[PDB]
């Protein structure tokens, strides 16, 4: 998540032991029944894309579902780009995120926090969560 | 955390998503042992106000919720006993020390709660109240 330090700067806060413990428990009991989704939504509150990837990579078992989820995320990232055209570089010299930045694969943790705390926010955590949930909805059909 | 109109990241109260998940946990698990890890994670970063919202969204379990209120009253009284204070801050505009009733959120405002939680060093009133609530839950789980 994101927290303010003693200097007043926004910086990363590691997913806590209590949050990761609960998410594992939810995965162990519910992955990937419909009931997993409200639990994921709450436990991922304030997550950066890097935190969201940590949560996804905690899922033990469910190899096939995790592959489908990844395919959905890849699709959404590419569509995001097509619906959010940008110039061939910052005119500057903050770049707009691409789909792969939103999914955490091409962006740094600092870029993620930059977007999420920009004025107005470019809510890359919330956007990635929407793609993840689209995927979870597809996967519930296997369960 | 949420961004205000001035572009600042400030505290925001317990969210609809968090509360919806908490309900669902109550509906399935209250107050079996497995409620406690879920309460602990869902209340991460909660103020005393957020924690009283969680407690007051439990439907039923009146016996349990009465035991919780007794546990909180006792821990608040013991907090006051074990944290002796002066009558008030010696310096004029200085932040007062929280008493038990401040930690339980009955005599403190949201502003004060956030003031303590973000002090340097923190006075983590949300964590303290959560400890009292979990102590109550560990008694109550014996009924379930
Ligand atoms: Cl976000
Ligand atoms: Cl706290």
Curated annotation (Swiss-Prot), chain A:
This is Capsid protein p24. Residues 57-93 are annotated as: Interaction with human PPIA/CYPA and NUP153. The lineage of its organism: Viruses, Riboviria, Pararnavirae, Artverviricota, Revtraviricetes. Phosphorylated possibly by host MAPK1; this phosphorylation is necessary for Pin1-mediated virion uncoating. The record marks 89-90 as: Cis/trans isomerization of proline peptide bond. The modification Phosphoserine is found at residue 16. Forms the conical core that encapsulates the genomic RNA-nucleocapsid complex in the virion. Most core are conical, with only 7% tubular. The core is constituted by capsid protein hexamer subunits. The core is disassembled soon after virion entry. Host restriction factors such as TRIM5-alpha or TRIMCyp bind retroviral capsids and cause premature capsid disassembly, leading to blocks in reverse transcription. Capsid restriction by TRIM5 is one of the factors which restricts HIV-1 to the human species. Host PIN1 apparently facilitates the virion uncoating. It comes from Human immunodeficiency virus type 1 group M subtype B (isolate NY5) (HIV-1). It is found in: Virion. Homodimer; the homodimer further multimerizes as homohexamers or homopentamers. Interacts with human PPIA/CYPA; This interaction stabilizes the capsid. Interacts with human NUP153. Interacts with host PDZD8; this interaction stabilizes the capsid. Interacts with monkey TRIM5; this interaction destabilizes the capsid. The chain holds residues 133 to 277 of 1435 of the full protein.
From Swiss-Prot, chain B:
The lineage of its organism: Viruses, Riboviria, Pararnavirae, Artverviricota, Revtraviricetes. It comes from Human immunodeficiency virus type 1 group M subtype B (isolate NY5). It is found in: Virion. This is Capsid protein p24. Transmembrane segments: none annotated. Phosphorylated possibly by host MAPK1; this phosphorylation is necessary for Pin1-mediated virion uncoating. The modification Phosphoserine is found at residue 15. Forms the conical core that encapsulates the genomic RNA-nucleocapsid complex in the virion. Most core are conical, with only 7% tubular. The core is constituted by capsid protein hexamer subunits. The core is disassembled soon after virion entry. Host restriction factors such as TRIM5-alpha or TRIMCyp bind retroviral capsids and cause premature capsid disassembly, leading to blocks in reverse transcription. Capsid restriction by TRIM5 is one of the factors which restricts HIV-1 to the human species. Host PIN1 apparently facilitates the virion uncoating. It comes from the Viruses. Homodimer; the homodimer further multimerizes as homohexamers or homopentamers. Interacts with human PPIA/CYPA; This interaction stabilizes the capsid. Interacts with human NUP153. Interacts with host PDZD8; this interaction stabilizes the capsid. Interacts with monkey TRIM5; this interaction destabilizes the capsid. Disulfide bonds: none annotated. Residues 56-94 are annotated as: Interaction with human PPIA/CYPA and NUP153. The record marks 88-89 as: Cis/trans isomerization of proline peptide bond.
